[PDB]
Amino acid sequence: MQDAITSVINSSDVQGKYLDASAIQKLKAYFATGELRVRAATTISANAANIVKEAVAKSLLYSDITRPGGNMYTTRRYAACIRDLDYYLRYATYAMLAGDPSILDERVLNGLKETYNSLGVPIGATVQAIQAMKEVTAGLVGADAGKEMGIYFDYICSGLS
Amino acid sequence: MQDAITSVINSSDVQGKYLDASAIQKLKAYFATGELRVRAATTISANAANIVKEAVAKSLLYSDITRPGGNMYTTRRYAACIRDLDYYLRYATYAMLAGDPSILDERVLNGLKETYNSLGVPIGATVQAIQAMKEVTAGLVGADAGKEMGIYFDYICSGLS
Amino acid sequence: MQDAITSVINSSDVQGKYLDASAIQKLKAYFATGELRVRAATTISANAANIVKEAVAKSLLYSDITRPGGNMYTTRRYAACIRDLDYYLRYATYAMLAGDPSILDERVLNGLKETYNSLGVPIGATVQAIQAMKEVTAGLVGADAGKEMGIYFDYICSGLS
Amino acid sequence: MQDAITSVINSSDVQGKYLDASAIQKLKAYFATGELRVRAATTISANAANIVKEAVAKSLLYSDITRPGGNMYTTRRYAACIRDLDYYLRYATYAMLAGDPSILDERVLNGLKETYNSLGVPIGATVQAIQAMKEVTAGLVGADAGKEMGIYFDYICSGLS
Amino acid sequence: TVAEIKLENGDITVREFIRILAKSDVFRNMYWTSLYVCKAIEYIHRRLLGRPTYGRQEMNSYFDLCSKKGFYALVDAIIDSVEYNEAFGEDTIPYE
Amino acid sequence: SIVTKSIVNADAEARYLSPGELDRIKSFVTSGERRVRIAETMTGARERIIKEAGNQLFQKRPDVVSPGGNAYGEEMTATCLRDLDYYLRLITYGIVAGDVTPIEEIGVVGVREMYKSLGTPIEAVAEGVRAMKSVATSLLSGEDAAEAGAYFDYLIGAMS
Amino acid sequence: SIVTKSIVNADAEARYLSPGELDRIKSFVTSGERRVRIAETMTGARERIIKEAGNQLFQKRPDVVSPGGNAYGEEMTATCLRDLDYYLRLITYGIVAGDVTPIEEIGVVGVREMYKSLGTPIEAVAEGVRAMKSVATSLLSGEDAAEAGAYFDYLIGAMS
Amino acid sequence: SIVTKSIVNADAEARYLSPGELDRIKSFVTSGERRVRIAETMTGARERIIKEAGNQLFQKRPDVVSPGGNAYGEEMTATCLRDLDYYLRLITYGIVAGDVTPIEEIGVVGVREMYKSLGTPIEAVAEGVRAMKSVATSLLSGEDAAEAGAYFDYLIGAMS
Amino acid sequence: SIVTKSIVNADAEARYLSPGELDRIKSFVTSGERRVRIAETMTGARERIIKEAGNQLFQKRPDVVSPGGNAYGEEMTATCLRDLDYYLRLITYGIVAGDVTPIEEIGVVGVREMYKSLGTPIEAVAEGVRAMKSVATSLLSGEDAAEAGAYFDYLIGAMS
Amino acid sequence: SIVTKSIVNADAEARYLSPGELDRIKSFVTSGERRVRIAETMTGARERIIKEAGNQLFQKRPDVVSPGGNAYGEEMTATCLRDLDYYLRLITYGIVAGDVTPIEEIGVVGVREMYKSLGTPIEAVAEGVRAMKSVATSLLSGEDAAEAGAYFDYLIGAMS
Amino acid sequence: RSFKVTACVPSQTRIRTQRELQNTYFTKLVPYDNWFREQQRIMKMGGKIVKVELATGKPGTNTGL
Ligand SMILES: *[C@H](C)[C@H]1/C(=C/c2[nH]c(/C=C3N=C(/C=C4\NC(=O)C(CC)=C4C)C(C)=C\3CCC(=O)O)c(CCC(=O)O)c2C)NC(=O)[C@@H]1C
Ligand SMILES: *[C@H](C)[C@H]1/C(=C/c2[nH]c(/C=C3N=C(/C=C4\NC(=O)C(CC)=C4C)C(C)=C\3CCC(=O)O)c(CCC(=O)O)c2C)NC(=O)[C@@H]1C
Ligand SMILES: CCC1=C(C)/C(=C/C2=NC(=C\c3[nH]c(/C=C4\NC(=O)[C@H](C)[C@H]4CC)c(C)c3CCC(=O)O)/C(CCC(=O)O)=C2C)NC1=O
Ligand SMILES: CCC1=C(C)/C(=C/C2=NC(=C\c3[nH]c(/C=C4\NC(=O)[C@H](C)[C@H]4CC)c(C)c3CCC(=O)O)/C(CCC(=O)O)=C2C)NC1=O
Ligand SMILES: CCC1=C(C)/C(=C/C2=NC(=C\c3[nH]c(/C=C4\NC(=O)[C@H](C)[C@H]4CC)c(C)c3CCC(=O)O)/C(CCC(=O)O)=C2C)NC1=O
Ligand SMILES: CCC1=C(C)/C(=C/C2=NC(=C\c3[nH]c(/C=C4\NC(=O)[C@H](C)[C@H]4CC)c(C)c3CCC(=O)O)/C(CCC(=O)O)=C2C)NC1=O
Ligand SMILES: CCC1=C(C)/C(=C/C2=NC(=C\c3[nH]c(/C=C4\NC(=O)[C@H](C)[C@H]4CC)c(C)c3CCC(=O)O)/C(CCC(=O)O)=C2C)NC1=O
Ligand SMILES: CCC1=C(C)/C(=C/C2=NC(=C\c3[nH]c(/C=C4\NC(=O)[C@H](C)[C@H]4CC)c(C)c3CCC(=O)O)/C(CCC(=O)O)=C2C)NC1=O
Ligand SMILES: CCC1=C(C)/C(=C/C2=NC(=C\c3[nH]c(/C=C4\NC(=O)[C@H](C)[C@H]4CC)c(C)c3CCC(=O)O)/C(CCC(=O)O)=C2C)NC1=O
Ligand SMILES: CCC1=C(C)/C(=C/C2=NC(=C\c3[nH]c(/C=C4\NC(=O)[C@H](C)[C@H]4CC)c(C)c3CCC(=O)O)/C(CCC(=O)O)=C2C)NC1=O
């Protein structure tokens, strides 16, 4: 739940002392990179229905999985697969705006073995969808913002496998 | 739940027999000290918010759990600990009139171990608190019922351990 | 739902007077005839499924009202009006112990007028049934308490017609 | 549920036209006075319990309804009343930022008029209390914002009376 | 049945009928008295709202409410929430 | 028992026990000697109760002995007198426990569906308890018949 | 009252009131000529109970009499005897009622609100009430204060 | 921080962060050096604040120190200064975070259940914060007293 | 009617009626005259189908005629014919509608709470109406006793 | 609006406004003179925006202006623009409020039932309101084309 | 202690294809201790409270509820 601000003032609360100059320097390291994230979080929010559109066509479409016998065959399953991908963009922008992958341990990595195993979701196609989604996102957002966003995409698929 | 009569009754019901004289002896001992417990239950419910204040200042306050780092440092988490001790004073006084620790078993101590271990709540401070609380109620009710009230407090500290 | 004990409590606090001398003989009138009521209310529960044996069998059983065309001819309208007579007995016995008809106009007489004019229930059949069940209780509790039960039975028939 | 920006929108929509010059003269008038409305929102919500503990002190604390015979001796009835007068402070400060009396209509005024007649409580003592609430709140926030909060207090006052 | 014939009369709605159902002693014996407390918070939340509990702060708001007010306001506070009233309505039987 | 109604009806409001309900606890442990003498005498003549109240029940309702009924033959009437001995035992639990609840749980809450699945009439056993209370209140004292006869009266009044 | 609490409990089970509880109303009515001596003794000492228990409270908590607490001054110590007299004007409403149903609805249900809303800490209010119900137990008999003192000491745990 | 409550208010609506709230985040990060200058002047005079506001609390309420109430000697008065040291520490945490959520999760949830168990008055803590408000706003600048004092009133809304 | 069951089957999902469902109505119209020929065979042969099949019930269950049971020879066995005559009247109401609900709303919905209060075995009614419709299927044909056979068996499974 | 959303979210938790949220309203009110001149940028040039998107819609889809289509003839074409005249009025309400809340309650919650009933294709409207978007942002400035265009792009995806 | 409301509430966001006549005219009985958590539910929905009636006993009676 916490961010780079509320990890510093949580860890400096619990020692009992006030905010000191070793911890304010950690806040200024977040405040120097804060302007980079708000430009990064704006452009993904205007293209959330289009990053998902290209990345499904990057790795998922015209496969076994799109075809019958695969998993995303029925229209009912298909939309869901966009929707079960669209949380992975919205929660990754929240952790990019936070500067901490503490949202991602908390909202979007709880059942993520056990929901997907108890629904017939293949894990190995979701990890292949996400670095197909990371490549089009870092192309859309830039080289500098792409590696900060690239931590929180690779935080998800490492916890998902 | 279960009561000391309804445990003596249910012992002679699953055997199917009638009331044995040993069971009749086991009911006269409940009725001989039943007049003591009915005066003991009022004197704790009079001071039920008072005892917890006299318990938490005996062994928890000015110590290292209500200081930065401990589980009672956050002062709106220490408010959980007061009503956590309101339960163990209430349900022990239920079990004093019941003549039976079966109030505490399937209502309090069934999932109490799994709640505390899933939060990092110190077990060893809770037994440090409840065994400190047992001295306070025995001071207020007298040494007659303090043996009776000391049993069901010790049932709480045994199953939590 | 309040009895005659709470009613003289209700009429004593509100004017600024204490528990005066004139309230005591209202309570002593309750405490004199209250021993009669516990002898009364047990024996109604002995015949609570037997007054309704006599309720149909005196004024309703072999009549033209039960003959196809009347109001009490359906099995969904038969069994709905034994429970509607059984509730009128049970709430009378609450008032038999209350010394007060102030359980009747909260739970019985709240919507009972308009639900009989709308559902096609004849009012005259009920007061020929309820007042018929006054005197069978006069043979079960003795002479005096049936005249006490006849107050709340007439309070039903004053509040139904 | 609306506010003063969308009420200008709604008064222009149901009339039909676009944002005409009379509405922009009304809407720019809201944005000038909207700066003082925030600085008087915080100093009410600071002293929200301190206002209502003094507004009862001007009118209600030594009167007909403290000597026995009125609304508040019964501890639930006084504690509802402090809680009712608390919610007048919340909704008027919700009415102060929103810039309209219509938020008070769909949240306070429609239901409350017929309950207070039916529950037998005086409206004349309530409108004496809110007028006593008006003369303390203007002393706290200053007089110039007191003319703002004097509007929505009177809309409760004229609405209830 | 005295909870039931108010619904058949139309004097109460179904949402008031569910509250007057699950305040009875037969529901209180079956799922409150004979269970652990945070089990019994979760099971009445399972039946009436038709979903499990959402997390921790959604359950800590219920555990203090039955610590102070009792079981009768636990079964109240499930029913007059926004997620009961706007996802089921005031005339539907709840479903999982 | 007396606590089992009071420890549940005050737990559900999550309060401590009100001293009106502590009268109910006090109210009996002074009666626990008087409640124990009566169930010792009820068990002590439990053979004479079933052989007498079972006897003139069939002079009142002779249908269940008759063929076409359930208890045709001695192999079923002795099975029928098990439920008389069970309900006599469930009376003696309820007098000692003090109130309505142990006879309610063990022998009441399924008897409209137990006896319907057995095909037996649910009303005829309700006639027998009124004769079981007739022979019992005929043999005990007068002051306890207002106590011990009323625990009979519950398992009548929720049977039929 | 104890009549009122039994009949609302029997409505919840949708049956008649049990013979376990019918002992208690029968025990209440034979003690209805026992409860009335407690009620008349508090008439004769209501100017004696309150005027001693104030100074018993003010020697226990003299923060009240200091300038700054919620009862400082002669006009302000009027209510700190009057609210104590109001609680002595609550027990005699429920001695003869037997239990706490006039104690709640006049005294308890919002008492965490209004003493916070008047600024008085209830821990001082419950202390003088505890100081009151030591003197009233000494004034009454040993059998009277055995049950009424249990009924006295409900309010201290109910307030704080 | 201001990042957290721009997320949990945007997760309940289940959509992205609109640019109506992203500009306030974008104005927050460029104004980072202003808040550290508020915080360092706040914590740099932590002995000037509590030794002045401890006196101004005791002139507003002299009953905590007078014999009978809560805080005595140089031990129990000193832990009253410890809690004011906590709330001075807890209010500079929300100034740097730019939001009232770090003072929320530590100290704006549940003390009305807590302080009544401790026996301290809740409202007398709130008069200590208003003396702490007037000391720090007199020390801080003319513009930031409307910003640092915009957290000081939030503690008054917690207790009172 | 089968028209009436079809609308509420469509009104629950707020739908116009399916053309496959109107095929069931159009088949019901062209077979509407056949069911009237089924119903007159019951009403014409009523005096041979009631006194015989009731006597089959009394031969299967001779518990009924014997005293101590529900019936007795002078009119109680005669009024158990008219309480059996009502159901044959309800079958003829049901077969001309092509629906179950004329059997339901007149003679199913409260029969258990009725006959417990009346003191008859409800299962003996179910064995009696089983004896009623065993001879009713052999009355008319072998073809028409199958789709009128589907309304015979429902009342057997409604009593128990 | 942001004023409406911040009250209703704070009313449901029974709380006053947070100081993080009060500075949201404070910046929203003071920037209200910025947003009203974006609204008068469109209403000052509304009769050109309708006419250019009038020519731009019927170019990309000519079946609606064709005979047989739902806007055929000089009065039946007049209406489709007047329907587009409503959506200039709606989006001008949305820029002023700073939210799509007047887009909701006035304009978009029933369009999937209305034009299906009215026979006009929703996707024919969805390009005409998209050709409105291309002619609007060419007339606006650089930064507010993201601000006003979010209310445009909300009306595309909620239409189609 | 039951009230007798009558409440007119509209459908805010959805267009319900089932009838739901009863979902616009709750004229139910609500008890006193839970009316006020229930009254705010109609009030936040945008409904109109038409009348409230004391179907139970007398106001001003401070005992016996
Ligand atoms: C206090 C002296 C000790 C202590 C308490 C503490 N408890 C919690 C959290 C919980 N306590 C419970 C308690 C119970 N659940 C039950 O079912 C029963 C039987 C009736 C009891 C007694 C529960 C459910 C919780 C957690 C749910 C929640 O989110 O609140 C906390 C909070 C821990 C936290 O970090 O949030 C604390 C501090 N801990 C101590 O240190 C004392 C020994
Ligand atoms: C002082 C101005 C007021 C006051 C203070 C007082 N407090 C205590 C005891 C405690 N206070 C706390 C409060 C907190 N601890 C925290 O960690 C935080 C947030 C960071 C808060 C708000 C706690 C937990 C205790 C108990 C143990 C402890 O001291 O930590 C006392 C002592 C009371 C006693 O009986 O020992 C005092 C005097 N009380 C007043 O009267 C002033 C109004
Ligand atoms: C963030 C919290 C959260 C989690 C974890 C979540 C998981 C999630 N994924 C699901 C479904 C699904 N998900 C997929 C998955 C995919 N499509 C593909 O082709 C890929 C292989 C894969 C993902 C890229 C399928 C194929 C179904 C099942 C839908 C169904 O059968 O109902 C479902 C069931 C749909 C439903 O709710 O009924 C859930 C709950 N939803 C959430 O809100
Ligand atoms: C606890 C207080 C209380 C009472 C007394 C009460 C009565 C009551 N009687 C009702 C119906 C009924 N009441 C009767 C009454 C009778 N039939 C007759 O033959 C006689 C005229 C009368 C004998 C008692 C009938 C026939 C119906 C059902 C109407 C129908 O058949 O559709 C209904 C409508 C719901 C239903 O039962 O279907 C109520 C609410 N309700 C209460 O809550
Ligand atoms: C019978 C039911 C009943 C209750 C529960 C009740 C509470 C009550 N106490 C009050 C005042 C008060 N009560 C007190 C009593 C106390 N404060 C102290 O500091 C003392 C230590 C303490 C007594 C233990 C005082 C001093 C006031 C007036 C407060 C003020 O004027 O600021 C008031 C406002 C004045 C009035 O109209 O009486 C109410 C309503 N009144 C009632 O009629
Ligand atoms: C937010 C919109 C809103 C309003 C305004 C509101 C009022 C309201 N006032 C009530 C009670 C009450 N209110 C008072 C009020 C007073 N006593 C006095 O002497 C004064 C004249 C006055 C206040 C100082 C009294 C005596 C009662 C109890 C009367 C009863 O029991 O019905 C009740 C019943 C229970 C409850 O408190 O929740 C409601 C619902 N409810 C609402 O939803
Ligand atoms: C603890 C609660 C409880 C009771 C009391 C009880 C009785 C009981 N009655 C039984 C049978 C039976 N019980 C009866 C008894 C009667 N039918 C009548 O007509 C009379 C009304 C009545 C006796 C006078 C009959 C006839 C059977 C045999 C049913 C059959 O053969 O179909 C059986 C199965 C036979 C056996 O195990 O020996 C049990 C267990 N069971 C229980 O679980
Ligand atoms: C169509 C819906 C409907 C039904 C079913 C109905 C039944 C019904 N059956 C009745 C009686 C009766 N029914 C029986 C029946 C039996 N006793 C036995 O031994 C046999 C096992 C059994 C049937 C085969 C007896 C003996 C009575 C008279 C009971 C008495 O007078 O005490 C009575 C009371 C007297 C009468 O008016 O006829 C009704 C109203 N009324 C209706 O409106
Ligand atoms: C502000 C919210 C609002 C909307 C959305 C609205 C729609 C609306 N469009 C209408 C008709 C119409 N609307 C159109 C518009 C169109 N058809 C086309 O072919 C074009 C492609 C398209 C425009 C993009 C036309 C041609 C008619 C008349 C159709 C007829 O009369 O059959 C009508 C019926 C007559 C009337 O205008 O009063 C309504 C109510 N009215 C409103 O108040
Ligand atoms: C099954 C019997 C039944 C019907 C028909 C029924 C109708 C009904 N029409 C309603 C609204 C409405 N009804 C109309 C009606 C019209 N518009 C016009 O201009 C014409 C005059 C008229 C139709 C030709 C309008 C404009 C509304 C929305 C206003 C409102 O919220 O009441 C609502 C309010 C809820 C909603 O739809 O948002 C209901 C419940 N309820 C029922 O129980």
Side-chain angles (χ1 to χ4, degrees), chain A residues 59-87:
Chain A
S59 66
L60 256 57
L61 275 181
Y62 303 103
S63 74
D64 190 19
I65 320 168
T66 317
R67 278 190 276 103
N71 207 8
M72 52 190 323
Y73 151 74
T74 59
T75 172
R76 159 162 48 84
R77 261 122 148 208
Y78 190 111
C81 195
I82 288 167
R83 183 191 66 89
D84 275 14
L85 258 170
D86 191 73
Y87 305 125

Side-chain angles (χ1 to χ4, degrees), chain B residues 28-97:
Chain B
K28 290 175 191 292
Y30 174 60
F31 292 152
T33 81
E35 288 149 318
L36 164 75
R37 299 174 176 182
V38 71
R39 197 179 30 89
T42 74
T43 49
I44 308 174
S45 49
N47 320 322
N50 192 53
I51 280 170
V52 172
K53 181 191 69 170
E54 301 157 281
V56 76
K58 184 162 288 207
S59 83
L60 303 200
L61 266 158
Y62 299 143
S63 298
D64 210 14
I65 42 172
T66 172
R67 265 203 273 104
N71 276 265
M72 289 141 51
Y73 162 66
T74 309
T75 180
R76 314 315 170 80
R77 203 198 304 146
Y78 165 82
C81 181
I82 305 299
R83 67 184 174 88
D84 206 329
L85 291 184
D86 186 67
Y87 268 115
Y88 309 137
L89 199 60
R90 202 157 56 87
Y91 271 112
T93 43
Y94 283 7
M96 195 200 51
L97 292 197

Side-chain angles (χ1 to χ4, degrees), chain A:
Chain A
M1 178 43 59
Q2 76 263 16
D3 47 37
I5 304 173
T6 43
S7 53
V8 164
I9 72 189
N10 178 77
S11 79
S12 199
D13 167 51
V14 80
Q15 310 194 47
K17 51 210 200 193
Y18 288 77
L19 272 176
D20 74 310
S22 76
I24 288 170
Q25 193 259 4
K26 212 168 304 304
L27 280 147
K28 298 296 186 50
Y30 173 65
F31 283 150
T33 186
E35 177 44 43
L36 188 146
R37 301 153 186 269
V38 184
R39 281 190 298 260
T42 305
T43 57
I44 305 173
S45 88
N47 292 269
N50 196 270
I51 294 164
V52 181
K53 174 190 100 166
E54 169 60 11
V56 165
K58 278 290 288 299
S59 66
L60 256 57
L61 275 181
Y62 303 103
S63 74
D64 190 19
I65 320 168
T66 317
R67 278 190 276 103
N71 207 8
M72 52 190 323
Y73 151 74
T74 59
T75 172
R76 159 162 48 84
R77 261 122 148 208
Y78 190 111
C81 195
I82 288 167
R83 183 191 66 89
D84 275 14
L85 258 170
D86 191 73
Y87 305 125
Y88 297 150
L89 197 56
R90 175 154 57 91
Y91 285 112
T93 53
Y94 293 167
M96 194 261 304
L97 217 49
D100 188 340
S102 185
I103 291 292
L104 308 184
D105 269 319
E106 159 177 342
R107 312 292 196 87
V108 69
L109 281 178
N110 298 11
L112 268 305
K113 320 293 289 287
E114 302 149 55
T115 68
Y116 281 167
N117 288 350
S118 305
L119 276 161
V121 185
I123 289 298
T126 309
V127 189
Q128 284 316 110
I130 277 170
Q131 216 195 17
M133 193 176 186
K134 199 189 70 185
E135 261 186 349
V136 77
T137 314
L140 196 140
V141 79
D144 199 331
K147 66 177 179 65
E148 174 82 21
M149 199 79 186
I151 294 175
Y152 307 119
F153 281 115
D154 308 334
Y155 191 74
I156 286 177
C157 50
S158 159
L160 196 144
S161 299

Side-chain angles (χ1 to χ4, degrees), chain J residues 57 64 70-71 76 79-80 82-84 86-87 90 106 114-115 118 120 124-125:
Chain J
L57 170 60
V64 286
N70 223 337
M76 214 47 70
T79 245
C80 239
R82 191 186 54 90
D83 190 76
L84 296 179
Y86 282 120
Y87 284 147
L90 257 294
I106 307 294
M114 163 179 50
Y115 286 156
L118 265 186
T120 75
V125 177

